[PDB]
């Protein structure tokens, strides 16, 4: 009669590493590292993202004739750009504080596009029907951004304009506008007459003024002239005032929005589905349970700390030593 005290053993081949030994085969282990992903761009906290596809952020907001499909955009928890997001500022120029805008619009609760300054009867005694370019072509035809209005000149006189808008939307209002800079002083007159024009925007929280910086410069996608894009978030009850003697690409449409916190812009060609997630990455949504992940450094949400590890397996059982 004998009794022996011993320990469990099985067919497990899981192996963990220890301070003293490498690849110790153990009976039961647990993985603390996430290295999978549904390879899908999902909803983040129950709110789908905003797809831009061919269009990029600048294109979408400015109203590029190729982003007509994003003119109804609403909700969205984070923005998605693709390896095809090349349709933006069809008309050469600098998008002032662009990165800053992209970041601030990362997440939006409500977003409504409205006519802040309607084309029809807003700029009477001003040419509001020639403001078209071939750089921004819509189906062969020469067009222009859908949210900005290129105010030309009526006949042979371009009078001083002045319009105001008071945000009574009960939420911030994103006002976008541009200043145009001709390649010369010859074009500066044939369009805005006053070869000494100026543009000025005034808010209780704004005042930068502008003057056409006519200079000789190369041509980009056609034009030698340049259009700098500007934006501003008009607070409730505040009043933005525009006035110019020329070179103003006046705001036509503006967006009334409600920003919550702030996510980011995932850029990936991965499919988009109705799946949900707490952590989203370029390659796909990740699981937010394990304390570490090696799927991608750039993530959005409540995510597992990114690590260069490939294996973080934790022993739960004991050394596995079978054989009979």
């Amino acid at each position: 009669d004998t009794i022996c005290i011993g320990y469990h053993a099985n067919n497990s081949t899981d192996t963990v590493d220890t301070v003293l030994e490498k690849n110790v085969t153990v009976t039961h282990s647990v993985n603390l590292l996430e290295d999978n992903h549904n390879g899908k761009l999902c909803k983040l906290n129950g709110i789908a993202p905003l797809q831009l596809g061919k269009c990029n952020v600048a294109g979408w907001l400015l109203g590029n004739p190729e982003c007509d499909l994003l003119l109804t955009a609403n909700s969205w928890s984070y923005i998605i750009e693709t390896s095809n997001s090349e349709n933006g500022t069809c008309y050469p120029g600098e998008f002032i504080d662009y990165e800053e805008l992209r970041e601030q619009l990362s997440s939006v609760s409500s977003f409504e596009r409205f006519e802040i300054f309607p084309k029809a009867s807003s700029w009477p005694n001003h040419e509001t029907t020639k403001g078209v370019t071939a750089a921004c072509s819509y189906f062969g035809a020469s067009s222009f951004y859908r949210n900005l209005l290129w105010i030309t000149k009526k006949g042979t006189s371009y009078p001083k304009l002045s319009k105001s808008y008071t945000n009574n939307k009960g939420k911030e209002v994103l006002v976008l506008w541009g200043v145009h800079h001709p390649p010369t002083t010859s074009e500066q007159q044939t369009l805005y007459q006053n070869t000494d024009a100026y543009v000025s925007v005034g808010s209780s929280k704004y005042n930068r003024r502008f003057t056409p910086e006519i200079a000789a410069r190369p041509k980009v996608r056609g034009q030698a002239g340049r259009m700098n894009y500007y934006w501003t978030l008009l607070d409730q009850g505040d009043t933005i005032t525009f006035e110019a003697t020329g070179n103003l690409i006046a705001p036509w449409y503006a967006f009334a929005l409600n920003k919550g916190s702030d996510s980011g812009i995932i850029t990936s060609d991965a499919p988009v589905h109705n799946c949900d997630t707490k952590c989203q990455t370029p390659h796909g949504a990740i699981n937010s349970t394990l304390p570490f992940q090696n799927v991608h450094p750039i993530t959005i949400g409540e995510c597992p700390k990114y690590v260069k590890s490939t294996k973080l397996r934790m022993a739960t059982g004991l050394r596995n030593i079978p054989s009979i």
């Binding site: 009669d1 004998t2 009794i3 022996c4 005290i5 011993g6 320990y7 469990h8 053993a9 099985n10 067919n11 963990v16 590493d17 220890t18 301070v19 110790v24 153990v26 009976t27 647990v30 603390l32 590292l33 984070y78 662009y98 990165e99 990362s106 916190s261 702030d262 996510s263 980011g264 812009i265 937010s288 349970t289 394990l290 304390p291 570490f292 450094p297 750039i298 993530t299 959005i300 949400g301 409540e302 995510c303 597992p304 700390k305 990114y306 690590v307 260069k308 590890s309 973080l312 397996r313 934790m314 022993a315 739960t316 059982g317 004991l318 050394r319 030593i321 079978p322 054989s323 009979i324």
Partner: protein, 160 residues
């Protein structure tokens, strides 16, 4: 192991013991079999279980968007952003890595310790009523039927 039992003086595991981590295997004239010590096994479970959760539960993370976007004239702050990312991504790597290597050693030691304590739990009860055969086995000097083998298991073995 640190406590000398696992792959130590009890050099192998029982593939036959299927209902627990640490246990017994008796052989008397009436039969033989494996029986996991329930109390010490459950406790080990509870503990290891609670250990894992800690390592996972204690990981606090808030909503964040790592990516940044800087133009060609913001290299410095862009590289600063890099330093932060690489920075934290060096801390967690080294940490997660060592956290595992260390807690793994610990877990294994824990199991060893549990086997040793069990062995010594019995070794205590039997005393001179059995010879130790340096392999985790005890051979009673007397006849030990199933009730007897039971008594030693549920820790109520008689006058030794």
């Amino acid at each position: 192991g640190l406590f000398g039992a696992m792959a130590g003086f009890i050099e192998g595991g029982w593939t036959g013991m299927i209902d627990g981590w640490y246990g017994y295997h008796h052989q008397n004239e009436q039969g033989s079999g494996y029986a996991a010590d329930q109390k010490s096994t459950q406790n080990a479970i509870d503990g290891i279980t609670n250990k894992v959760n800690s390592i996972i539960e204690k990981m606090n993370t808030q909503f964040t968007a790592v990516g940044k976007e800087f133009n060609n004239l913001e290299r410095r702050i862009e590289n600063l952003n890099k330093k932060v990312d690489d920075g934290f991504l060096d801390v967690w790597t080294y940490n997660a890595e060592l956290l595992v290597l260390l807690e793994n050693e610990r877990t294994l030691d824990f199991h060893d310790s549990n086997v040793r304590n069990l062995y010594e739990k019995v070794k205590s009860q039997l005393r001179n009523n059995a010879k130790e055969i340096g392999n985790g086995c005890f051979e009673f000097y007397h006849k030990c039927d199933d009730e007897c083998m039971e008594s030693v298991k549920n820790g109520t073995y008689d006058y030794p």
